[PDB]
Design a protein around this motif. Structure first.
Motif, PDB file in Angstrom:
ATOM      1  N   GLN A 143     -11.574 -26.348  13.932  1.00 25.07           N
ATOM      2  CA  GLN A 143     -11.077 -27.731  14.015  1.00 25.07           C
ATOM      3  C   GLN A 143      -9.893 -28.045  13.090  1.00 25.07           C
ATOM      4  N   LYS A 201       0.705  -9.707  10.679  1.00 28.46           N
ATOM      5  CA  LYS A 201      -0.746  -9.479  10.703  1.00 28.46           C
ATOM      6  C   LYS A 201      -1.448 -10.189   9.541  1.00 28.46           C
ATOM      7  N   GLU A 242       0.839  -1.200   0.000  1.00 29.86           N
ATOM      8  CA  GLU A 242       0.000   0.000   0.000  1.00 29.86           C
ATOM      9  C   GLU A 242       0.883   1.263   0.000  1.00 29.86           C
ATOM     10  N   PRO A 243       0.540   2.310  -0.776  1.00 31.28           N
ATOM     11  CA  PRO A 243       1.220   3.598  -0.693  1.00 31.28           C
ATOM     12  C   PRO A 243       0.886   4.278   0.641  1.00 31.28           C
ATOM     13  N   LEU A 244       1.910   4.515   1.467  1.00 36.22           N
ATOM     14  CA  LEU A 244       1.814   5.290   2.706  1.00 36.22           C
ATOM     15  C   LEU A 244       1.324   6.712   2.382  1.00 36.22           C
ATOM     16  N   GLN A 245       0.075   7.015   2.738  1.00 43.25           N
ATOM     17  CA  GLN A 245      -0.461   8.378   2.749  1.00 43.25           C
ATOM     18  C   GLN A 245       0.170   9.157   3.915  1.00 43.25           C
ATOM     19  N   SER A 246       1.403   9.622   3.733  1.00 39.84           N
ATOM     20  CA  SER A 246       2.026  10.635   4.586  1.00 39.84           C
ATOM     21  C   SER A 246       1.962  11.974   3.855  1.00 39.84           C
ATOM     22  N   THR A 247       1.026  12.830   4.254  1.00 38.84           N
ATOM     23  CA  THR A 247       0.790  14.159   3.670  1.00 38.84           C
ATOM     24  C   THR A 247       1.784  15.235   4.145  1.00 38.84           C
ATOM     25  N   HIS A 250       3.704   5.850  -9.368  1.00 40.43           N
ATOM     26  CA  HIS A 250       3.795   4.425  -9.713  1.00 40.43           C
ATOM     27  C   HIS A 250       5.083   3.944 -10.411  1.00 40.43           C
ATOM     28  N   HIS A 260       7.381  -1.628  10.533  1.00 41.10           N
ATOM     29  CA  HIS A 260       5.989  -1.528  10.090  1.00 41.10           C
ATOM     30  C   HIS A 260       5.629  -2.575   9.017  1.00 41.10           C
ATOM     31  N   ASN A 290     -13.320 -21.932  10.967  1.00 41.49           N
ATOM     32  CA  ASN A 290     -13.208 -23.390  11.149  1.00 41.49           C
ATOM     33  C   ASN A 290     -12.193 -23.765  12.242  1.00 41.49           C
TER      34      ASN A 290
END
Lengths: 306, 410, 108, 269, 57, 223, 115
Positions: free
Chosen positions: F207, F196, F129-134, F145, F189, F205
């Motif tokens: 079992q 995660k 994901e592109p880090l949205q750091s504004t 890209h 991170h 499920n």
């Protein structure tokens, strides 16, 4: 010797009221006071929860699987006065229909034989029976039998599509005469047989032997027998077997199977119509079988050990 | 035709674009368009203005439909070939010019013709694609033709505009944003914190808002766990969302405004099923964050049985037991309004669904820990309240039976 | 606007709309005030600026759809607002067509 | 009846269900016997071809003389439960259930086969259903099943004409069939968005085929160097306007027809 | 025509008693289609019978 | 030799790269790099020492991916042999080679400290994901890209491949590798996001114990 | 009547009544259960179609604004095509009745085919 094959943790949050296997015995539906219906894949001693169906506003009393030729369809009925039709499409379960035409708790649901299409009978505490029919085109059609039972209808069960003996006496060119019949039990202590004639439902027979509310009724599957058989159970602690040797005589003979010391809640036939399961207020399930002399014997008392 | 090709080339090289637009081209109009289209297809999109020339050429002759088609082709090629901030800005302008051209046309004719995405435009003059055996692969003889209406062009315009808003907010994302599908673009906008643009995109494409609510819940959690630096960064993405009422009172933390934004989105975007509230609660509980009282109180009024299952799923046995005690008190008639229960337990009230199986799982989970005197005190309090409920239920059922047993003398 | 400084007026109006400082209830009026600037013979709003205005118009329409419970789509104030919206759509489409032609002619 | 049912149920539980059928075949009453045998087949018939399953099927068909139709009917019902629409159609075909097979193929297999260009797959079912003895029993064969088959046959004949330098008699037979298909593609009942997509792809392909056929029916005596093949607009226009095309493609086709009609008017002056 | 539906509509005009299935508000033949509301179940059965006999005639 | 063989003019030694690499691995090269080179107090004193060993360690999985696959298959065979010897009550054979375990430990120790803030561990991570750091509005080069460099895609594929069906013998070396690769703000991170992502695939499920043993759910549920 | 016969909101017999009256064979066939009903439906629609064709050929001033389906207007009816469609039916009862000696005789009497 009856042996426990599998134990299902249903993860219901309240009392379970019904538990039904699908036609192939590979899926289990359960319903509860928690207002949910749960569906499990049951294979090789495992269970997998595949659906948690929510749409009832009160305790769900009964579930019923439709015949697999129409796909994976389940009916449920509840204290909330609803009948819900669930269908699986592409591995997802959805609510395809909701019927709210009852004024009180819908206590029982039973699918008709598949020869008749998608037809569902629904018994309610409003004393009526509703017959829901899906033709494939348009809305569900509804026929309501008002005042089917006084005070309330507790149970409904469909007769087999083919009359006993009709395959033995047919010279090679008449189609079996398919007669839509079902049995009901109610709070008026009656077992009643209903027949469709000229597109109307009529009380065909009134069966009188119980002294208190009929709790459940089960029409036996007709596998090659010349006789029609019904089981009924009651709050009076009695279980009756009703037999009719001739579908023309309309004559039904009661045989007392047993008198329990407490209420009998449910009666269920094996698919082969050779064993009757009976469930009492004593928390026991007893299995009954007819002997060659016509006598009924208890072949298993399954104590709930643990 | 060869002299016409030479004329078009020399006038384009000399920048004498006016003469090229004004000439009548009697019977040669399709050939000029074909030559300029072939050159517009062959040349780099950033160095020469042949699409803008084709557009001017069609606008001058009132051919708004072909003008729209050319500007749409330009916008599509810019999106494929030129993944720069300047390329995205030209793409948004070309789709806007296309939409403006089609709005000048009668609605009955306001459609563009496209070859389906996957029709190999063989570059005129590419060597025939030979199979491994050296045979000319037969041209697949069905260029399926897609008809784009004004509504589908409005979706592509909104998608290009959302790509440009992301690329303006973070110039490093321009390369990724240029290829992103509407679903991937929602995920990227949610990471950036551009929630209103993500919601607008979900509405235009009829996508589920679930990813927007999960991402906003994740930003609220990170803000609540974050130091002064996370609070400073939060004002930037909070300002990028339409809080219709930012009164900058010197007393609101960035965390309080993030929660106000969440409340405003839940109020504006009510789902028919509790899905958005469920999704936020399930996300908060997955991070071990205590649930806000306003969210609990709203969800108590909507579906208390689903809340109880969520507390049980995350082993929150105390909160689950308090919820059951309050829900039982609500059924008994104390605080029934806090649970959305229209009428308390009476002989004539509608049957409220009691989540008995979830309460029995709570009783089991409280009972498995025999060592905890606290869990036993809770379990005994719960049992005593369940007995009070079952006694009142028995009485209400007996009084209902008496109401049913008074004979109809009317 | 009264001093005939249309370019500066247009930029300020756009800034007021994009800064989300305007109450949502006032957005239609603000868009309507942009209408005379959109219909001028000279392109005052750029293609980019026009897209932004279009976005604002769409955001409003979206906001109206979220606030109206299915039981109040039947009383006589929906017809005037719909006419105003259509007028704005037409004006925005016309300006966009003009702006693309003018901006494109300058880039050639 | 109790003895036959109880012993058949014992054999079913032991996994010898093929012999439980043999026990049920001793029931004197034909309707009860038939019901019990079909009921057991519907429970125990497996859709997966194992050597054991095939040995049991061979035992039922060859030793017990059970109709192969009933085994295929049970496999079709099981394939429906499993969601395998392909195997359901195959077993309904083998089971001689022509009407259910045709309804399943047209509603659920035809659109997916047309969109994926898998014409041989749709032709295996529609070809067997096209037999003159089966078609008489099929409801709405002419309005649905035949239209998809005639479409496949028009594609097959066009591919043959592209590979052989073909005689003008095959081109006239192709023209008459394409013109008939243009009328019948409109009458296809669309229930899903996929059926509309398949109908639109069929319509687009049929219009392109009609143009190619009309261009190839010309004698080579109008070679003036520099004009695209002169398609006669009077024969093309009545059929393109009846095809259920997407609005964008219908507008492109109408623009092409109006530009070519303007070119006919400019060459006749 | 539609005697039971007419009766149920007249009774609703006289008594505000709760929860009866919404029925057509108008008695023109297009009312069930236009309103997407059902007739009384007896009137619907009577119409199905009548239409079958009209077809036979 | 493998680097040069990508270029047409040196054919005579192009096949001699693989046998030389097998001889080097047979000489415990990764263990020697861990203890003798990276373990020296003087390795972290010169930036260009770190850059050259970084390049040597990252060139191996990027230029010779078939050898990495052979080392993996051998470690899976050795894990089966150790499990079989343990079931028979026998000591594991002393001839077992730990080449892949030593490579994971080398990566873990090389990145354990970054004294010059070179962020060289970022080559093992691919942003999903592109880090949205504004918050750095301050260089006017719009380039949307860039696809991540082919090198970074191969190294991030190596880290993911090493997690897939992890043998009990490689559990500790793999966690030590991740610990080394999680040194630094962005690296930590991405490691958090990887652990995660490994947990999210089976909530319905109960079992089938089919969760990855290298996940946050497994770590905290075990505690 | 044609539009009312196609509207699925109407009862099957109401649709069939308007289908008989408008010449809509597709909406009439679902209520025709016997051979005699099916033959009647085809012949009734054939006569109604041929009558409508002659009226349109004779009246110079038809407004194009009210299109009945082209399939009904351009139908090339033969006596044989009716009995071929009866052989192509999915209705088991009609296929059984079509093999009865008197229905075979009635077919050939209608076709005027003595040989």
């Amino acid at each position: 010797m009856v042996s426990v094959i599998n134990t299902v943790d249903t993860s219901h949050e309240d009392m379970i009221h019904d538990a039904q296997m699908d036609y192939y015995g590979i899926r289990l539906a359960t319903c509860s006071s928690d207002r949910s219906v749960k569906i499990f894949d049951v294979k090789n001693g495992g269970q997998i929860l595949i659906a948690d169906l929510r749409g009832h506003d009160g305790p769900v009393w009964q579930v019923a699987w439709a015949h697999p030729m129409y796909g994976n369809i389940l009916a449920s009925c509840s204290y909330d006065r609803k009948v819900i039709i669930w269908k699986e499409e592409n591995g997802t379960w959805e609510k395809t229909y909701e019927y709210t035409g009852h004024d009180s708790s819908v206590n029982s649901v039973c699918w008709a034989p598949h020869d008749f299409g998608l037809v569902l009978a629904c018994g309610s505490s409003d004393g009526a029976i509703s017959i829901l029919t899906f033709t494939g085109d348009g809305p569900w059609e509804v026929k309501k039998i008002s005042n089917a039972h006084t005070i309330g209808c507790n149970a409904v069960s469909w007769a087999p599509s083919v009359i006993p003996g009709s395959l033995v006496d047919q010279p090679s060119s008449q189609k079996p005469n398919y007669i839509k019949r079902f049995v009901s039990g109610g709070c008026d202590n009656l077992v009643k047989i209903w027949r469709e004639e000229d597109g109307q439902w009529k009380e065909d027979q009134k069966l009188e032997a119980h002294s208190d509310w009929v709790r459940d009724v089960a029409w036996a599957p007709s596998i090659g027998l010349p006789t029609s058989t019904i089981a009924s159970c009651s709050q009076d602690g009695r279980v009756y077997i009703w037999t009719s040797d001739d579908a023309a005589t309309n004559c039904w003979t009661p045989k007392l199977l047993h008198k329990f010391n407490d209420v009998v809640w449910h009666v269920s036939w094996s698919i082969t119509a050779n064993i009757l399961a009976v469930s009492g207020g004593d928390n026991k399930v007893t299995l009954w079988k007819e002997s060659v002399d016509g006598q009924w014997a208890c072949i298993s008392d399954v104590n709930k050990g643990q | 035709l060869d002299c016409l090709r030479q004329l078009v080339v020399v006038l384009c090289e000399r920048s004498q674009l006016q003469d090229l637009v004004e000439f009548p081209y009697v019977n040669l109009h399709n050939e000029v368009v074909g030559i300029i289209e072939s050159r517009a297809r062959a040349v780099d999109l950033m160095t020469h203005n042949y699409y803008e020339l084709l557009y001017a050429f069609h606008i001058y002759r009132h051919n708004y439909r072909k003008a729209g088609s050319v500007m749409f082709e330009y916008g599509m090629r810019l999106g494929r070939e030129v993944r720069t901030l300047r390329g995205l800005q030209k793409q948004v302008n070309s789709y806007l010019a296309c939409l403006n051209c089609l709005r000048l046309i009668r609605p009955e004719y306001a459609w563009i013709v496209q070859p389906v995405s996957g029709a190999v435009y063989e570059r005129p003059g590419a060597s025939p694609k030979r199979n491994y055996d050296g045979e000319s692969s037969a041209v697949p003889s069905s260029s399926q033709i897609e008809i784009l209406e004004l509504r589908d062009l409005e979706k592509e315009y909104v998608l290009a505009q959302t790509r440009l808003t992301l690329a303006k907010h973070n110039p490093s994302t321009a390369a990724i944003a240029g290829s992103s599908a509407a679903e991937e673009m929602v995920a990227l906008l949610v990471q950036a914190g551009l929630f209103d643009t993500a919601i607008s995109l979900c509405q235009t494409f009829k996508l589920a808002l679930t990813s927007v609510f999960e991402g906003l819940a994740c930003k609220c959690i990170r803000l609540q766990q974050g130091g002064e630096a996370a609070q400073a960064e939060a004002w930037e993405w909070l300002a990028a969302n339409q809080l219709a009422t930012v009164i900058t009172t010197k007393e609101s933390s960035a965390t309080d405004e993030a929660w106000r934004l969440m409340i405003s989105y839940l109020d504006k975007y009510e789902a028919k099923n509790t899905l958005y509230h469920h999704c936020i609660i399930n996300k908060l509980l997955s991070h071990g964050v205590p649930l806000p009282n306003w969210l609990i109180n709203r969800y108590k009024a909507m579906d208390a049985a689903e809340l109880l299952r969520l507390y049980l799923k995350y082993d929150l046995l105390e909160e689950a037991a308090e919820l059951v005690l309050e829900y039982v008190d609500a059924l008994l008639g104390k605080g029934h309004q806090y649970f959305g229960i229209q009428a308390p337990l009476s002989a004539t009230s509608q049957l409220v669904w009691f989540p008995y199986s979830a309460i029995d799982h709570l009783r089991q989970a409280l009972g498995e820990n025999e060592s905890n005197q606290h869990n036993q005190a809770i379990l005994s309090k719960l049992q005593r309240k369940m007995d009070e409920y079952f006694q009142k239920l028995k009485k209400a059922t007996d009084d209902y039976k008496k109401l049913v047993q008074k004979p109809l003398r009317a | 606007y009264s001093q005939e400084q249309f370019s500066e007026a247009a930029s300020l109006l756009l800034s007021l709309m994009t800064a989300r400082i305007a109450p949502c209830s006032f957005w239609l009026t603000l868009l309507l005030d942009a209408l005379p600037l959109l219909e001028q013979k000279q392109v005052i709003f750029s293609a980019e600026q026009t897209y932004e205005l279009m976005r604002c118009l769409e955001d409003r329409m979206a906001a109206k759809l979220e606030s109206t419970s299915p039981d109040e789509i039947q009383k006589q104030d929906s017809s005037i607002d719909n006419t105003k919206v259509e007028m704005l759509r037409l004006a925005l489409a016309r300006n966009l067509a003009r702006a693309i032609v003018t901006e494109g002619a300058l880039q050639e | 009846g109790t003895l036959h049912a109880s012993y058949a149920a014992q054999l079913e539980n032991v996994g010898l269900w093929e012999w439980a059928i043999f026990v049920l075949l001793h029931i004197p009453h034909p309707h009860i016997r038939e019901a019990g045998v079909r009921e057991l087949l519907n429970r125990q018939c497996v859709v997966r071809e194992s050597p054991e399953s095939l040995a049991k099927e061979n035992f039922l068909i060859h030793r017990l003389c059970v109709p192969a139709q009933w085994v295929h009917e049970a496999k079709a019902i099981r394939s429906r439960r499993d969601g395998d629409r392909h195997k359901e159609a195959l077993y309904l075909l083998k089971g001689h259930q022509w009407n259910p097979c045709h309804k399943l193929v047209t509603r659920h297999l035809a659109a997916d086969a047309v969109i994926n260009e898998n014409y041989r797959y749709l032709q295996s079912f529609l070809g067997e259903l096209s037999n003159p003895e089966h078609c008489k029993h099929i409801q709405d064969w002419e309005t649905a099943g035949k239209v998809y088959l005639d479409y496949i046959r028009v594609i097959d004949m066009l591919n043959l004409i592209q590979q052989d330098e073909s005689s003008g008699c095959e081109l006239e037979k192709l023209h008459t069939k394409v013109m008939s298909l243009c009328k019948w593609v409109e009458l296809i009942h669309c229930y899903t968005a996929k059926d509309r997509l398949a109908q639109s792809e069929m319509a687009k392909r049929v219009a392109n085929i009609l143009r190619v056929v009309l261009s190839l029916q010309q004698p080579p005596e109008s070679m003036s160097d520099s004009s695209e093949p002169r398609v006669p607009l009077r024969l093309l226009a009545p059929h393109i306007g009846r095809l259920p095309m997407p609005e964008d493609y219908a507008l492109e086709e109408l623009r092409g027809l109006t530009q070519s009609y303007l070119r006919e008017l400019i060459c006749d002056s | 025509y539609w005697e039971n539906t007419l009766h149920t509509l007249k009774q609703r005009s006289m008594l505000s008693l709760g929860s009866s299935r919404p029925l057509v508000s108008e008695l023109d033949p297009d009312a069930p289609i236009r309103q997407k509301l059902p007739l009384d179940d007896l009137d619907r059965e009577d119409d199905i019978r009548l239409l079958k006999y009209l077809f036979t005639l | 030799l493998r680097g040069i063989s990508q270029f047409s003019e040196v054919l005579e030694f192009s096949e001699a790269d693989e046998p030389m690499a097998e001889i080097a691995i047979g000489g415990n090269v990764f263990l020697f790099l861990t203890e003798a080179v990276v373990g020296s107090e003087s390795f972290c004193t010169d930036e260009f020492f770190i850059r050259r060993i970084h390049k040597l360690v990252t060139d191996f999985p990027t230029l010779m991916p078939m050898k990495v696959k052979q080392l993996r298959n051998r470690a899976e065979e050795d894990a089966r042999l150790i499990q079989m010897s343990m079931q028979m009550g026998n000591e594991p054979p002393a001839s077992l080679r730990r080449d892949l375990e030593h490579l994971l430990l080398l990566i873990g120790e090389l990145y354990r400290k970054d004294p010059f803030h070179l962020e060289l561990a970022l080559e093992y991570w691919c942003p999903t994901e592109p880090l949205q750091s504004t918050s750095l509005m301050g260089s006017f080069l719009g380039v949307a890209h860039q696809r991540p460099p082919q090198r970074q895609v191969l190294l991030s594929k190596f880290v993911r491949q090493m997690s897939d069906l992890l043998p009990a013998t490689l559990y500790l070396p793999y966690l030590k590798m991740l610990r080394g690769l999680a040194s630094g703000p962005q690296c930590a991170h991405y490691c958090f996001s990887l652990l995660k992502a490994n947990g999210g695939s089976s909530a319905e499920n109960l079992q089938a114990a089919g969760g990855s043993p290298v996940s946050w759910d497994h770590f905290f549920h075990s505690l | 009547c044609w539009r009312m016969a196609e509207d699925e909101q109407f009862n099957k017999y109401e649709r069939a009544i308007y289908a008989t009256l408008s010449g809509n064979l597709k909406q009439l066939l679902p209520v025709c259960e016997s051979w005699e009903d099916t033959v009647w439906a085809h012949f009734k629609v054939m006569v109604d179609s041929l009558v409508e064709q002659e009226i349109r050929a004779s009246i110079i001033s038809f407004n194009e604004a009210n299109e009945l389906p082209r399939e009904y207007l351009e139908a090339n009816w033969t006596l044989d095509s009716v009995f071929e469609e009866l052989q192509a039916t999915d209705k088991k009862r009609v296929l059984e009745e079509n093999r009865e000696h008197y229905h075979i005789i009635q077919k050939f009497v209608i076709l005027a085919d003595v040989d």
